[PDB]
Structure formats: C-alpha cells, structure tokens
Design a protein around this ligand. Structure first.
Ligand SMILES: Nc1ncnc2c1ncn2[C@@H]1O[C@H](COP(=O)(O)OP(=O)(O)NP(=O)(O)O)[C@@H](O)[C@H]1O
Ligand SMILES: Nc1ncnc2c1ncn2[C@@H]1O[C@H](COP(=O)(O)OP(=O)(O)NP(=O)(O)O)[C@@H](O)[C@H]1O
Ligand SMILES: Nc1ncnc2c1ncn2[C@@H]1O[C@H](COP(=O)(O)OP(=O)(O)NP(=O)(O)O)[C@@H](O)[C@H]1O
Ligand SMILES: C[S@](=N)(=O)CC[C@H](N)C(=O)O
Ligand SMILES: C[S@](=N)(=O)CC[C@H](N)C(=O)O
Ligand SMILES: C[S@](=N)(=O)CC[C@H](N)C(=O)O
Ligand SMILES: [Mg+2]
Ligand SMILES: [Mg+2]
Ligand SMILES: [Mg+2]
Ligand SMILES: [Mg+2]
Ligand SMILES: [Mg+2]
Ligand SMILES: [Mg+2]
Ligand SMILES: [Mg+2]
Ligand SMILES: [Mg+2]
Ligand SMILES: [Mg+2]
Lengths: 429, 429, 429
C-alpha cells in the first residue's frame, strides 16, 4: 500500500509510526508526509532501551516497520495518520516486542488452520484531570450501572468516540454507563486477533485523547477506587478455519464443540501463569478477589473456574460458539493478552485438556460450597507462575522473561512503599 | 504479698490491674486501694471478646488475677500501682492469654531444669504527637547513630526514664540515639523470662506515657519511615539451671556449648513460623528484607542464617554464653515472643538440631555469594508457616490459632487498601 | 582514676562516653553512674559502621574506652560528665579513629623528645535556628570586626561560655566579635596537643549547646555567606622537650630556631595534601581563594607561602617561638588536624626542609607580583594530593584512606546538584 500517495489523496500531513512496548506504553515518532516512503520501507529508528523492551543502551537501533494496513486517520485530527508497527532488531522481527510475539503465535495457529478472532471490552472511568475524583460529582448512587442520567451527562464525549468508530468501520453497537460511578463501556465488533489488537491499542489512545479535549481524563486502571467495581477487559474468543467456519460452534453443552472445551481446558490449565500477563500490575490484584463493592458485586473472577452465562467465574459462556475470558483488566497489553491466551488455548486443544466441571453457582456467595482453586493473589506469585509455565513462557518467547523482569522490579519498588493503613494501625503498637 | 498493706505503707491510691492481649494491647482496670484485696484474690472481671483474645460476647467474664510480685509504683505518678495479670476463664488460666501461654512453656522447660533468661532491646522513635514527623527537626544527617547532639537534645526525656529504671532496680546501663533520625534505645539487665516480659510490657507503657508528658510521642512501629532504619526488638537469650549455671556457656565455637547450638538449631529450623509471632504486623515485613537506608544498612535480618559478632544475620553471637535473635521488631508481643522463641529452642535441644554453618560475611553485600533461605516475605506467608509448624503451634497452644485468625483478618483488610504508588503508576495504563 | 567515686562526690548522674568520627561528628552513649565502672574498664560498645569509621555492618562491636583524665562535668548541666574516648576494635586501638590516629603521631614525636603544643582559634557564627540568617538583624555594618555593640548584644551567651572555660581551667583570655557580621571568637591557652584536641571537640559541643539554650544556633561552617569572611580554625604551633624548653624559640629571623624553620618547611612542602585534611569539605574551598569580602579582606590563605606577623599567608609568624598555620577552617577534625600538621612538621624537621623565602607583602594585592604556588582549588584535588603524599598518608595511616573514600563520595554527591546560578545563566543558552 502506497502511504505517500494516500497522504496526498487524503490530506495527511504527518504519520505517527507507533509501537506498543512490553508495559503497554504507546511509543511513536511523528514523521512528516515527505518522509513516509522511506520510513515505510526501512522503518523508524529508536533506542530500544528507552522503552520497555529490556534492551541495552549499547544495542543498535531498533527499527519500527509500520503496517500500512493499520492506517488510521485520527478522526479528531485527520491531518495525522496513525500506524501500528513491528519492531525489528538486527534484521529480524524482535521477539520481545508484543505485536511481534502475538504475530508469531498467530502464525503457529494459522499453520494448523486455526485463526483466533476476539472482541475486547475496554471499560474505563472518566475522572478529573488531576486524578482526584471521577469527572461527574452528581454520579453518586449505590447502583449506578446503566444509569441513563449519568450516561447522557457525558453524551458529548461518548457519542463523539462512538461516531468515530462508526466512521472507522469497527462496527460499534452499544455504549453505556458501567457498574462503578464514573465508569463507562463502548463495544465494537470482534475481528481477527491482530485487527482487534491494533484497534484495542488505538482505542485507548483515542479515548484518552478525546477525554482530554473535553477537559476530562480517561483511565483504564484496574481498581482506581477501593469500594467500587474495577476496570475489566474481558475477551470474547473464537477459533475459525480459513474457509470461514467457527470451530467453537458445536453440539456439546451450551452450543460448544469439543475443540472449544479443549481450548477452555488450556485456559483453565494455564490460568496461573496467564494471570501474570492479563493482570500485569500490582493494582490488578485488588480487582481480583476484591471485597464486595457498594453496587453489590465485584463482577471479576476470584477462582479458576467457568460457568454458563454466569458472570461470577474466570470464564463465562455467553452464547453458542464462543468463550468469554473475564480475567483480564484494563492494564492488559493489547498484544501480549491475545498472544498469552492463544498459547494457552492451543495447548489445550493439542493435549485435549479437560476444563473440568461447569459451575452454575454464584461463586461470590457459594465459593465455600465447592472446592475450587483460587487465582494468584498478588503480582509476584502470578509472575512466578508465568516463569514456571513452559507452554506460556515458550509461546511468548523472550517477551515472557523480559516482562517478568520488569514486573519483579515493579514489585520490589511497591513492596517498600509505606501505606497510610500501616501508619494508622501500627503507630501505637 | 499483701497489696492492701503495701498500699497504705507506700501511699498507693489506685492499682492498674493489667493484662496484655494477643495483639499486645495493654488492657487494664483502675481500682481504688479499698478494693484491691478482693481483686487480688478473685481477679478483676472483663468481657474477653472486647480485647484481642478471640472469645465470644456470649462467654462468661474472664478474671484477670494480678501477680503481686509484679507491682510497680508508676515512678511518674507513685499514687498508682501497676500489676501484670494472668487471665483466667472458667476457673483455669486461659491458654489464649499471652502471659499464660508464656508461663506454660516456661514450666515445661523448668521441669527439665532449663530456665530461659533474656534481655530485650526495645528501640523506639520519638515523633510529633500527630505522627507526621520525628520530634526533632534538627536531627537530619545521613548517619545519625549515636549522635551526641541529638541525644542530648532529648536528654530530659531519656534521663527521666533511665532514672526510673535505676530506681526500679532494672539495672539500666546505657542510652543512645539509634541509627535512624529520631530513634533511640535504652538498655537494661536481662532477667528470668517472665521478669523481662513484665518489664518489657511496662517499659513500652512508661516510654509512651513520659513522652506524652513532654508533649512528644513514642512509637515502636517496625518501619515508620521507608528510607530509614526500622525499630528492632532483638532478644539476647540464655538457658540456666536452677543452681545458677549458664548452659549456653561452653567450649565450642565462640564460647558456646552444644546445648546452645542445638537451641540455635531450633531457632533456625522453626524460623519461618517464628517470624509470624515476632514480626506480627503487615508493616513488619517492610523492616525485614528492606532496601538499603540512608545510613547505609538496614541492620535487620533478610535470611535464616547466623553469624558471629555480626549484625547482618537472623542470629548474632554477641559474646560467649548467649545468642542474639535479631529477628523480632517493636510490634512483637512481650509474652508470645519469648514463648515462641522458647518453644522453638527447646525443640532444637530435644532433637539436637543442627543450626548449619556460621556465615562470617556481610549478608547485605554477599547474600548472593551463598545459598541461603530467605525469611517469609509478608505476614500472610509467615502466618501460614506458623499454622503448619506443629512444635510452635502446639507450644503456644490455642494462642497460636487465635493469633493467626486475627492476623489473617488484618491482612484481608490491608490487601484491599489502595495506595498512592498504585495510583501514580497505574492511572495511565 | 576512680570514675564511680568521682560520680558520688561531684553528683554526676550520667556519663557521656564520647568519640569523634572521621567527619568530626561527636558520637556518644549516655550511661547512668551505676554503669560507669564497667564501661571505664571494658569500654562502651558501638556498631562502628553506623558512624564515619569506614567499617562493615558485619564487623564486631567497636569499644570506646573513655579517658578518665578527660572528664568534664557539663558546666551548663553538672549532673552529666563528658568523657573523650579511644575507639578499640578486635582488642587494639582502631587506627581509623581520629583520636587514636593523633596519639600514634604524638607517640612518634615523643620518642624523639619533641612534644607538640597547640592552640586553636575556633571562629563561629551565631545564627537563627533555621539557619536562614545571622542571629542579630542589627549587625549590618561593612566593617563589623570587634564591634562593641554587637558583641555586647550577645554578652549573655559569650560571657556564660567564657566563664565556663574559666571554671574548667582552660585559661580563656579574650572574646570578640570577628570580621563577618554574626561571627565571634573566644580564645584560650594552648596546651599539649591531646589536651587541646579534647578541648576543641568539647568546645564545639559547648558552644552549640549553650547557643541552643539561648534560642540561637552556632555554626562552624567554613563559608556560610558568599560575601562575608569565613570561619577559620588557625592553629598556633610549638614543639617542646620533656624538660620544658620551646624548641621553636631561637636566634634566627623573628626569634625562630632552625628547628622551627625546618618544621615550617614540612608544612610548606606538604601543604597540598595537608589541605585535604584541614579544609575537609566542599565548602572549605569557598573560604580559601575567595573573592574580596564586604569588610575588605578574606583573611584566609590563597597560596602556599609564609610571612612574618602578616595575616595574608598560609603561615604567619605571630611572635617569637611559634608558627601560626592559618590554613585550617571550622570543619577541620580536632584530632586529624594536629595529627596531619604534626606529620608534615616532623618530616620537615627530619629532612631539614627549606620553607623558602618569607614574603613581607600583602598577598591579596601583590600575589601577581611574585611566583607562588596556589593551594588546591577544590576538595577533589586536595584529596588526590593527600593520597599522593606518602608522609601524610603513611603518617595518618588508614585514617587517611578512609577519610579520602568518604570525601570522594561527598564530592560525587555534590557535583551532581543543580545550582541556581546555572539555571539563571544557562536556561537561555
Ligand atoms: N464469535 C465471537 N468470537 C469472538 N468475539 C465475539 C464473537 N461474537 C461476538 N463477539 C464479541 O464479544 C463482545 C461482546 O461484548 P459485550 O456485548 O459487552 O457482552 P457481555 O460481555 O455479555 N457484557 P458485560 O456485562 O460487560 O461483560 C463483542 O466485542 C462482540 O463483538
Ligand atoms: N547471658 C545473657 N542472657 C540473656 N541476655 C543477656 C545475657 N547477657 C547480657 N544480656 C543482655 O543482652 C542485652 C544486650 O543489649 P545491647 O547492650 O544493646 O547489645 P547489642 O545487642 O550488641 N547492641 P545493638 O547494636 O543495638 O544490637 C542486654 O539486655 C543484656 O542485659
Ligand atoms: N608557644 C605557643 N604554642 C602554641 N600555641 C600558642 C603558643 N603561644 C600562644 N599560643 C596560642 O595561640 C593562640 C593565639 O590566638 P589569638 O589570640 O587569636 O592570636 P592571633 O592568631 O594573632 N588572632 P587572629 O587575628 O584571630 O588570627 C592562643 O590559643 C594562644 O594560647
Ligand atoms: C459484569 S460487568 N457488569 O460487565 C462488570 C465487569 C467488571 N468491571 C470487571 O472488573 O470485570
Ligand atoms: C544494628 S543496630 N545498630 O542495633 C540497629 C537495629 C535495627 N534498628 C533493627 O531493625 O533491628
Ligand atoms: C585574620 S582574622 N581577622 O583573624 C579572620 C580570619 C578568617 N575568619 C579566616 O577565614 O581565617
Ligand atoms: Mg460488556
Ligand atoms: Mg462491562
Ligand atoms: Mg464481558
Ligand atoms: Mg542495642
Ligand atoms: Mg540497636
Ligand atoms: Mg541487639
Ligand atoms: Mg584569633
Ligand atoms: Mg580571628
Ligand atoms: Mg589567628
């Protein structure tokens, strides 16, 4: 695809050549249209150590090579065109780069005529620019989910973003106020994993950018308020053949196939290590296994279990032909997340993993009634599980060890921070 | 001993009948002299559930029976006499009460002609009454240990308390500024474990009380400041026969006997569970394995190891005939601590436990150079180790399970508190 | 000497057992009288790494053995007795301890029937407790030296301290306001080096303590105000035989002997390295070679030169029979200063060093008029010179190397601080 020509036809003056680092941070260069042809072929250069890629100041430049198919004219500023990119190093795609890691797992699966398609539910809060409070002081009621008043009070921001998604062809189909005061969700059609991953990366950038233009702020933080529901990023998952058949579609329980259930078996089996990737922050572990919120439920997973159309489990079966992994949160990396999930699912399919028995109970109420394995309770334990999980660690390649190193560093930093609770309850010991 | 007569002779108008609950909180009734004779015989009544003893609102009164030998006229207010007490329930000493638990282990040991004597080093900080800062704004230098200026700037408080200890016959022998800005230590002679435990309980009360009278505040909090040395409560330990011989005194390495080393073997072997008791708060785990402080060392244990006259280990051998357990902190219960240590030591002696090899290295610098077992990294893991440790759990009796329940409750409470570090580093995920 | 009995006679309740570390910081333990007899024999224990002694946390306790001859009942608080002490380590005097290092050099000199006697001029400023300004807002004139008004405005502080020195037998003989606004000096009789060093150390603690009691603050900082004269610590020096004759007394120029001039020769010859010790802080180098002050002269050295009764050189010859080294400042260690001076001096005598030509000029005006070596211009260069100077390094022993390590660490910290002058002059580059 000819980016220079497109720039002229469409009035694009600058391109953002953008990649996602291990921690999910969007890294980009802003290049004027006159330079795009060279950049598209040779890539934009960066000092990799300066992003979260676990390199050395002494290493040669990485080159981020833009995917011309990913082009998006910023709908709020159409003179700029955003491009997702694969980081290359020493002439080959760099295995520590999330988008590259994802593509590698996708290629393996594709070689067996299995194609991951997913949709993401990127819940977010709208907050004051200073982070002190949610953006809407009138959004206070104990059960605010789907609140019409508070939704319409932020119509201008929500509708603007939704209209952008319409224009971009993402097939958006609904927006609402979510279960925490100040929290929202906007949904759009699932797609090939790579397409969704790119869209997912762009979406966060778009929401943050538009929120700012309205003097607001958006956060995807997993648990920004102790007593309110957190930000999930559920992924709905299905596996397709090249000919266009959904392999999860079946005659078994709840309209699922044995392939779907073996995939689920992979999810269940690798859940501990998978948690490290899709719940990648210290804060993630305050969303999981959270005490009950003011709205009456956390809506997040506590245990390594699955139910039917039941939102109290790690996995929900929402309808025939797909799985809903409810585990990931708003911090989850848009590339590592599908990559990690796929690696786990493929292994489930290859080993014909047994997901175990479906639990048709409210796990928040009756978790005690049954013997169920708890999810990792903190980042450090989840990371240890990642490192000990060969399938996962090997599926993600060098990204896994790099990720683990960073998360351990974050943990060492966090575990030394004095908290107000400690002062209040220990000063008089 | 006749408390009523003593009240008349000495001018005592009120007695504090006092016990220590599982969490270390001093519980007391203030009874006028006219009522002491009845109270001494029958005990002072309390609703046990209202203290940290793990009872029920429905249970009959506990009766705290004062130990007349423990009598202390408050030196800053001699009209009041403090008494340590054994909690009784349903006619017998209550095994969940710390002072009772300690006495039970002491009796077992005594039955084998082994008598625990210990000394405690109760480091504390002097801080503003509001807890915002240390009491002395001029105490700022990077290495403040033994600072003459800052010590003398608090002469009036320190000297007053030291003079009280002189008058009480505790054999105090030194005071200094400790290694953190704002921190102090006052040392006194070791004694029979029960005597030291009573003194230890009284000392904290005395320091807090006198600090207040000077418009200051004292805290024994393990780690009140992230970047400064924490509050230890090292215990120096020796075992004696009734005839007055020190069993730790020997011809082995560093002037220690095989009995001493088998006791050390118990300490090493039971270190994981022991940590729960002598490091009993969430905050305790920020003193252990702490990043280096502004003064150049944490001075607290990281690993389950021992050295010679070497302050970088869990156990130090300070001189012939004793061990220094450097593990406990300022939160450690004055009764459960010697009780837990003794249970572990006795078992070491009975099984002829091998403490392993002495490490003559700086463990902060060369911890990597050797294979050493790390101490539990947080309260919840330490508590799990306590529960799985039969010798310890059985030695402490029902106090252990009660303690564990409370600490788990504290953990569940803490783990849900949102921290500033999380907000700062996750909001932009 | 019987410290326990002296305590009973003189009503001393506590002893400060004190030593000076490499950075001049006073370290002490406050011990009740009941413990002094043991401490005087065995020493008070300290963890040496916690002070500026260049040790390891894993090292055995140092033991500070007090010198009973040094006893001073704090004149402002006679219930407390101050004791200067020698630090011992592993059974021997610890060569890195300044007082031990000084005694070592005195011992060499004494073996040759040469005994150093010196006097110190410990200039200080009286400032606001917060350190923002001098204590006296009416002290403002351009030439305030010997100002009668400003001197009498601080009569109460100055007279109290001077009267203490009378009672202590130091032979004080004058006090005045010095050349900078806010600055004072109180002089007393020279003595054997060790006596004067102990007095120097105590004096600084006395001035600081008494100032505080008056709601003031004393500082001995070398250059606390960029435009005002700084704090010197001139030392007056003479060498005596055991028989009591002044070896510097002679028939040569200005009533000096050849021994005096050879001693001078060591000072001149060893000046670059001596500077690191007697000007031991980054700030020291803003007193040396300073631009002219508001009062018209810095009165501090710029060059490795000497004159007669002439205050513009490194060395001044004030009268028959002694030298004045004007080099040292208020930060100079009371023990390392005479120790390094004596080492340079002894070497001068043994090599019959030639001090060169006396300069009878004002070095501030006619410095250009003559070829003269400049002093090191900053701490890093002075330390480098200390390290390269065999006599000095060997003379001070391990104290020198340890001192050098600490000062390089200080320099590394300092050189990275951004200053306001830089922002002002560079922001618009
Ligand atoms: N066959 C499929 N494979 C993968 N994703 C799909 C498939 N079919 C639908 N989806 C997507 O699944 C997502 C559904 O999200 P949503 O409408 O919010 O449902 P829900 O998860 O039941 N709601 P919530 O209460 O927030 O958890 C959308 O992105 C759909 O496009
Ligand atoms: N045989 C003994 N058995 C038990 N305790 C003893 C024995 N001998 C001395 N002690 C006590 O051990 C304690 C020593 O504390 P301390 O003087 O502070 O020494 P240190 O622990 O080497 N100092 P620190 O740097 O703070 O850790 C005192 O309470 C002594 O009384
Ligand atoms: N023979 C000597 N050896 C060593 N010190 C001496 C000797 N004779 C006198 N002193 C001391 O030298 C010091 C004199 O300092 P001082 O009275 O301030 O004189 P000055 O240095 O000429 N004053 P200043 O203008 O501040 O430099 C006193 O401590 C004297 O006791
Ligand atoms: C179940 S829901 N109403 O979709 C809410 C999900 C919740 N925010 C979460 O943490 O996953
Ligand atoms: C080794 S020391 N100088 O006694 C300090 C001990 C430290 N406060 C601690 O946490 O044990
Ligand atoms: C020469 S003087 N008048 O004694 C002043 C000395 C000056 N304070 C100095 O820095 O040495
Ligand atoms: Mg949804
Ligand atoms: Mg939702
Ligand atoms: Mg969902
Ligand atoms: Mg101590
Ligand atoms: Mg201590
Ligand atoms: Mg100790
Ligand atoms: Mg003078
Ligand atoms: Mg002077
Ligand atoms: Mg002088």
């Amino acid at each position: 695809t000819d980016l220079a020509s497109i720039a002229r036809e469409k009035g694009i003056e600058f391109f953002l050549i953008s990649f996602t680092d291990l921690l999910g941070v969007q890294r980009a260069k802003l290049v004027p249209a006159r330079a795009i042809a060279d950049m598209a072929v040779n890539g934009a250069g960066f000092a990799g150590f300066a992003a979260w890629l676990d390199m050395s100041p002494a290493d040669a430049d990485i080159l981020a090579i833009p995917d011309p198919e990913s082009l998006i004219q910023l709908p709020w500023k159409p003179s700029v065109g955003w491009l997702a990119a694969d980081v290359h190093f020493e002439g080959r795609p760099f295995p520590k780069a999330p988008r590259v890691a994802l593509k590698s797992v996708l290629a393996r699966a594709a070689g067996k005529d299995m194609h991951l398609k997913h949709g993401v539910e990127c819940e977010f809060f709208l907050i004051q620019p200073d982070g002190s409070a949610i953006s809407d002081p009138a959004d206070t009621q104990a059960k605010p989910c789907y609140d019409q008043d508070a939704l319409m009070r932020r119509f201008d921001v929500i509708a603007e973003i939704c209209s952008y998604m319409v224009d971009l062809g993402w097939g958006p189909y609904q927006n609402d106020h979510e279960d925490a005061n100040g929290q929202f969700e906007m949904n759009w059609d699932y797609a090939d994993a790579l397409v969704t991953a790119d869209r997912h990366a762009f979406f966060k950038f778009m929401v943050k950018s538009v929120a700012e233009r309205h003097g607001l702020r958006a956060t995807f933080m997993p648990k920004p308020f102790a007593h309110l529901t957190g930000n999930g990023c559920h992924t709905h998952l299905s596996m397709w053949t090249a000919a266009g058949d959904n392999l999860f579609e079946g005659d078994g329980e709840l309209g699922l196939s044995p392939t779907a259930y073996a995939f689920l078996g992979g999810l269940i089996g690798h859940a501990k290590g998978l948690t490290a990737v899709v719940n990648p922050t210290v804060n993630s572990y305050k969303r999981l296994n959270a005490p009950v919120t003011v709205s009456g439920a956390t809506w997040s997973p506590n245990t390594i279990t699955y139910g039917g159309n039941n939102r109290t489990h790690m996995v929900r079966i929402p309808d025939a032909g797909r799985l809903e992994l409810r585990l990931p949160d708003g911090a989850a990396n848009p590339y590592l997340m599908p990559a990690a999930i796929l690696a786990a699912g493929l292994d489930g399919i290859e080993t014909q993993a047994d997901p175990g028995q479906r639990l048709d109970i409210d796990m928040y109420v009756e978790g005690h009634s049954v013997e169920a394995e708890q999810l990792p309770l903190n980042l450090l334990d989840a990371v240890r599980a990642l490192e000990a999980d060969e399938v996962l660690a090997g599926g993600l390649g060098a990204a896994a060890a790099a990720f683990a190193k960073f998360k351990r560093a974050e943990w060492a930093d966090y575990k030394s921070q004095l908290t107000e609770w400690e002062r209040r309850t220990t000063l008089d010991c």
